[PDB]
Write a protein that binds this DNA or RNA. Sequence first.
RNA 1: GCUGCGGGAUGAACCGAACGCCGGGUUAAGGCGCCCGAUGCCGACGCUCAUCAGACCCCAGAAAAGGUGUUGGUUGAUAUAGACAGCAGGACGGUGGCCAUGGAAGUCGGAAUCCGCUAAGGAGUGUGUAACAACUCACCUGCCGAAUCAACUAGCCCUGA
RNA 2: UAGCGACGUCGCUUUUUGAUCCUUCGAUGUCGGCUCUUCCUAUCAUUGUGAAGCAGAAUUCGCCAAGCGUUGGAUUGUUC
RNA 3: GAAGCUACCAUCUGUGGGAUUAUGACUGAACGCCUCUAAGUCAGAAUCCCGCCCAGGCGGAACGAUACGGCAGCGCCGCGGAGCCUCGGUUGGCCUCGGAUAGCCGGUCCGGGGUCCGGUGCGGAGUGCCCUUCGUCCUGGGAAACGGGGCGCGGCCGGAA
Lengths: 195, 139, 175, 191
Amino acid sequence: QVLVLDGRGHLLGRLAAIVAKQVLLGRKVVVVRCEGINISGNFYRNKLKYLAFLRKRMNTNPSRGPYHFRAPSRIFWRTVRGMLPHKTKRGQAALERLKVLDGIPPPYDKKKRMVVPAALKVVRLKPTRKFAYLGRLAHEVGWKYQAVTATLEEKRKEKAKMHYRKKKQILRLRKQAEKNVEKKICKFTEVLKTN
Amino acid sequence: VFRRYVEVGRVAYISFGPHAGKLVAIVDVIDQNRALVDGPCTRVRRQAMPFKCMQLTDFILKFPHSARQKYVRKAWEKADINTKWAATRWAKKIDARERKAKMTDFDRFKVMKAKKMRNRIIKTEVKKLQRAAILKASP
Amino acid sequence: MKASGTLREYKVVGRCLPTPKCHTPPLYRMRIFAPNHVVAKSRFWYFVSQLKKMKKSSGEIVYCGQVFEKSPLRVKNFGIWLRYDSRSGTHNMYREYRDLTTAGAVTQCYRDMGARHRARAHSIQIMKVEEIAAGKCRRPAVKQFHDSKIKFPLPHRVLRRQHKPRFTTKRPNTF
Amino acid sequence: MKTILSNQTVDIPENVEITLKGRTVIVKGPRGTLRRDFNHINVELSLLGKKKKRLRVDKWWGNRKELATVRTICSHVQNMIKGVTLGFRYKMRSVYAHFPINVVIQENGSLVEIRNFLGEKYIRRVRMRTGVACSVSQAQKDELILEGNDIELVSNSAALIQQATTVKNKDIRKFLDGIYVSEKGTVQQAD
RNA sequence: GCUGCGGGAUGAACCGAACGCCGGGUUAAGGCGCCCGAUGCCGACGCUCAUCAGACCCCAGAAAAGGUGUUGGUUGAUAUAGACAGCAGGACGGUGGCCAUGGAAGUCGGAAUCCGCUAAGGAGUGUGUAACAACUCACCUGCCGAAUCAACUAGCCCUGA
RNA sequence: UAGCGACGUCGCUUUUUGAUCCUUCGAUGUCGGCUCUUCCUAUCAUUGUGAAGCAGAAUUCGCCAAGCGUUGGAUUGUUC
RNA sequence: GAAGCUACCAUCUGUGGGAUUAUGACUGAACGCCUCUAAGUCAGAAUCCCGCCCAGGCGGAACGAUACGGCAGCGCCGCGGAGCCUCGGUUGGCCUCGGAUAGCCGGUCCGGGGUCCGGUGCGGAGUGCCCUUCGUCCUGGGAAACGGGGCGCGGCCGGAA
Ligand SMILES: [Mg+2]
Ligand SMILES: [Mg+2]
Ligand SMILES: [Mg+2]
Ligand SMILES: [Mg+2]
Ligand SMILES: [Mg+2]
Ligand SMILES: [Mg+2]
Ligand SMILES: [Mg+2]
Ligand SMILES: [Mg+2]
Ligand SMILES: [Mg+2]
Ligand SMILES: [Mg+2]
Ligand SMILES: [Mg+2]
Ligand SMILES: [Mg+2]
Ligand SMILES: [Mg+2]
Ligand SMILES: [Mg+2]
Ligand SMILES: [Mg+2]
Ligand SMILES: [Mg+2]
Ligand SMILES: [Mg+2]
Ligand SMILES: [Mg+2]
Ligand SMILES: [Mg+2]
Ligand SMILES: [Mg+2]
Ligand SMILES: [Mg+2]
């Protein structure tokens, strides 16, 4: 009943629009690994845009004003909130369906991740265009947990490597068993109706 | 890298469009976005089709550039593309997709009933092969 | 003029009304590119009024016929003469295109003019369209195709189906 | 105008072996090995021929700005071959009109210590990039030989040394003082 | 004003359209990434990269001028009797010529401006000397080897801001 | 053409004045000074720079640049 | 004149890292040469962010104690029974990284190299397993030696974001 969408390789707005449209329908969406979301344009251009956004702030009381977030997950959350009607009760109720998270936590490392090809940088941008990584962009402005994020990502990748090796061994054994039991299993129906 | 090329005499497959699902022969390239295609033995007339509309294959035929139909059909029959087209793993997958789409309710029921007999024996043999490998790696 | 969709070739003949001072007018003919016969006749009247002392009231159109391409299956090269009008001043131009049909070449010319020079169809006068051989092709973008045994791959092909499997576990290979 | 094909061929000598896992180019020769990632060029590289092994660089449907990199790739491969065969040696001479510049090497030429530059008491320490070794040549006065394999590293270290000695708050035309790269060549001759 | 309604986010005059209460279909102007109904078309051609992009009459921003950043066009001039770039060689004599003068010996000036051997050298395109010397250029030639040079013109972008 | 640059010509500003009277006449308390906060840059100095008719020093013209300072008094109600 | 408040009217302290602007540079084509740029690299500052410091959210964690007195009261495990408020779903998918001018699978040999299949992806999410089952009983063929469910026991914590 949930949609676990990977974050790496997807464009910021191209993915956020799809998530904002899918949340208003009722599907609970969880965007994992938000530090890999790419943004079109020059990295210095995106940095200048983010700094111009940071400059905007209430004069009389900055604490009671625009709350600028530094984590890339919170950046993506604010981007989706900018498209959702958050000032109405429908948008307020839909905002809990979206779960933006940095890294791949225990509740989501075992779940298979989905990829939306309509937001992938490979098909969205030309191979000669410049892009900026949201993780580096956030780390350059008031983000401190990039090192531990990368360390935990390395750990979970080294674990998933062994898991995939085990799965590949199981697949090899399955293919060997299929090739071994040739008799007693005709299954001409499977071939005539093509699996 | 780049083992396929468009050229005078390349047979391609139409993925989408009015002639979707048929093979054509690229006679010549026009304006780096569309090419003239003949497809004499595949029941299609000579016309211009975009490059993004067609999908390249492995077979190549010997045509002179801007050749006539009587000269392209002869080379098509000499290369004998139609009969060897069924003897490939690609047309077989396409026909498999067509059959899975043409499945009826009785066919789906028979497939579902055959899966019960097919997968269980495979699982009980995998359970033996895994323990055999464990016993082999035990010492 | 709109030049919507694809253009069409029309041979339009016309002559002034028989007046007591002189009969049997020279019956001038023109070759107009237009989407339909109505705008074809309108453009013919505009051109013949700009050329000679002829108007729609004092004149008449004798015949207006669609002209089909003599070889729609052959790849040909067309040299287009333009008398276009820019923001500052009007200028003449010679372009070259490669297409199967004369109407197709004229459509390509209209689209390329509107794209590269921001020139609307209101201020574009097609002067002359003639098929030229490969030896008299001065444009390099067209001359680069006059080579037999031409070979080139199609690298980095777009997915084109981004939204049919909108949610998937796949990453397009693009090769 | 979307040129169809742009190809460039590079010859390879018998001493050096070149390999490619993709856009990555690895050249193994008599003096060390080089490896460079060309993942930001988007151009085809293919080696062909036995006992000759010529490397062709192919670009399909490139604009005027994209057709320029096909020559830069071949120039980089040529520089890699030159550095792995003969190496790159930059002789930098120091102009010391009044105050003699005292240059010394610290650890196997990986660190350069410059003393008494225009009389300043400040000690300028410039570290060399990995793989570049510097020394004080003999039979010549106030010069430094910087030898290495990668040209983009040797010349980078040379530029660092040159910019370390820069006049400030004074005239640039006057006060001609500092280490300038006089000569650029190879370590091995007859090639 | 005497006037609601659909678009221009917002609105007195803009664009459609005028008004009893309802159900079905269609449409004008406008729009189809999400706010927000509809392109989730296997849409077409081409232009554009900004460290201040750009995004729809009124309407809410900008000029003269410039760009070896790209993309088209026009008028022209050169090149197998081997150019344009690059490397290398020559770049002389009458003559340190005529008006000047503290010095002008091609190089601060006015007018002029030719001649002979050459393969080519201009009473000399610039740097430099108070002047002479020196570097360099027009010009010719040696190697390479096939296209190249110059001026305008207008679309996006950039400086001007 | 380091620095200026006439004869001409193209722009920004509302820190001067002026033109109109659109809101305010059942009242928006109309000069200056004192105290205090913030912002702007068309930068006086300070940080890092380029160019001079920049030998050094002292200077002049610009570039990214508003983070930090830009005072004490005589007479004047004075802004100046 | 004690104590306390107070004075630049006495006293103590006020600190560094990153990406970079302007600018100077490396390699280097476009454009045989040149060029800081066209793709890629380097140094770079009272500016930008953070570090130090100030307050901690309708932010969450770790730990202690968890109701005597005489009938009580409250927790944990295993539980059978009734009734009330809420609003939402009609099988679950237990996972390599990474590119898109490249990669997947299988493997003899010396984490990488070579070779062999697959490649508009079929060891494929247009995918695959459990599956579309109304239940009970008698009796035959194939498969099945794990048995098949666990209010059951012991060994490992297998895995800390
Ligand atoms: Mg903070
Ligand atoms: Mg000075
Ligand atoms: Mg009235
Ligand atoms: Mg009225
Ligand atoms: Mg009205
Ligand atoms: Mg309205
Ligand atoms: Mg009207
Ligand atoms: Mg109207
Ligand atoms: Mg109605
Ligand atoms: Mg409309
Ligand atoms: Mg919608
Ligand atoms: Mg502008
Ligand atoms: Mg508006
Ligand atoms: Mg206004
Ligand atoms: Mg221009
Ligand atoms: Mg007034
Ligand atoms: Mg009052
Ligand atoms: Mg008041
Ligand atoms: Mg301040
Ligand atoms: Mg104090
Ligand atoms: Mg720079």
